[PDB]
């Protein structure tokens, strides 16, 4: 059900990422580097375990999870959160909860591109990833 998301993806457009980071309390110097970083995201499955790697020249992350089962996560910006990833309307929806706060990381395939929408507070960031062969 998650198969068209699988593979290696490269960032090719970003809108409002500074707003999103600032909403999360990320400091100005980190935002500055992040605004010039183009991550590679690798999504793989093994049975119903997904592994999502995010690689860059600044920070790397990796998470593994089963759809629909909560997992602990420590984010790129060092938030310790309770997470769950599900499919919803064909979109991969990742919800993070901590300190009563929430943020969603929603991935959808549109015309073969992977569109990542990040929402926290009022901030809405849209990042476009393109498949690598
Ligand atoms: C590992 C690389 C994280 C993105 C590169 C910037 C690095 C650090 C700044 C704090 C980011 C925090 C929220 C990341 C949201 C996902 C971005 C995406 O997957 O596009
Ligand atoms: N296990 C932690 C992660 O939970 C946290 O996300 C990361 C910060 O990012 P980076 O590894 O790029 O410093 O540090 C470790 O790897």
From Swiss-Prot:
Record keyword Acetylation present: yes
Annotated binding of hexadecanoate, by residue: 127-129
Keyword DNA-binding attributed: no
Chain positions found as Phosphotyrosine: 20
Binding site for octadecanoate: 127-129
Keywords: Acetylation, Cytoplasm, Lipid-binding, Phosphoprotein, Transport
Modified residues (Phosphothreonine): 8, 30
CDD domains cross-referenced by the UniProt entry: FABP3
Domain of life: Eukaryota
Subcellular location: Cytoplasm
Broad class of where this protein is predominantly found: cytoplasm
GO MF annotation: an example: long-chain fatty acid transmembrane transporter activity
UniProt: (9Z)-octadecenoate binding residues: 127-129
UniProt modified residues of type N-acetylvaline: 2
Modified residues (Phosphoserine): 23, 83
Cellular component terms (Gene Ontology): cytosol; extracellular exosome; extracellular space; nucleus; sarcoplasm
GO biological process: brown fat cell differentiation; cholesterol homeostasis; fatty acid metabolic process; intracellular lipid transport; long-chain fatty acid transport; negative regulation of cell population proliferation; phospholipid homeostasis; positive regulation of long-chain fatty acid import into cell
Domain remarks: Forms a beta-barrel structure that accommodates the hydrophobic ligand in its interior.
Role description: FABPs are thought to play a role in the intracellular transport of long-chain fatty acids and their acyl-CoA esters.
Family: Belongs to the calycin superfamily. Fatty-acid binding protein (FABP) family.
Protein name: Fatty acid-binding protein, heart
Species name: Homo sapiens (Human)
Upper taxonomic lineage: Eukaryota, Metazoa, Chordata, Craniata, Vertebrata
Gene name for this UniProt entry: FABP3
